[PDB]
Design a protein around this ligand. Structure first.
Ligand code: NA
Length: 159
């Protein structure tokens, strides 16, 4: 079955720039700006669009060793990005995939709002509980703030 979770968060970075950096250039940025969160990102196959598979490895001591994420859809006009966690980490005999949707919208003050949906597709009769969702939110927030700090400090990056 499916467990649906949603959250929103804010950024001080304008939407288009944040989408170009945080969403479209994570493979480069996350290990650079948040090395204590992400040890590496490997592109396994594909050229960036639907179907691209990346292997995201976590540092030693983290709960999970890695996940593989698959890009589902990329909307450059509306700053929407869909991807799924398809292997590793929590994926296995209790959990088939986690499908995610991110949308970034501009705010009049020159920042943005990120709207995030996470849909857990379980196998069998298993509950997706609060702690698991909190950890994913914490990871996302950490990555966002690290990219935000980098973009504030490197004004010529991603214009
Ligand atoms: Na704002």
């Amino acid at each position: 079955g499916v467990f649906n979770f949603e959250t929103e968060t804010t950024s001080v970075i304008p939407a288009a720039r944040l989408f170009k950096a945080f969403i479209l250039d994570g493979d480069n940025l996350f290990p650079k700006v948040a090395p204590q969160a992400i040890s590496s990102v490997e592109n396994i196959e594909g050229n960036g669009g639907p179907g691209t598979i990346k292997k995201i490895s976590f540092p030693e001591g983290f709960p999970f060793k890695y996940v593989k994420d698959r890009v589902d859809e990329v909307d450059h006009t509306n700053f929407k990005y869909n991807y799924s966690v398809i292997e590793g980490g929590p994926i296995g005999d209790t959990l088939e995939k986690i499908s995610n949707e991110i949308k970034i919208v501009a705010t009049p003050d020159g920042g943005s709002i990120l709207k995030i949906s996470n849909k857990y597709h379980t196998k069998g009769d298993h509950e997706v509980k609060a702690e698991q969702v909190k950890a994913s939110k914490e990871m996302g927030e950490t990555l966002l703030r690290a990219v935000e700090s980098y973009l504030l400090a490197h004004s010529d990056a991603y214009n």
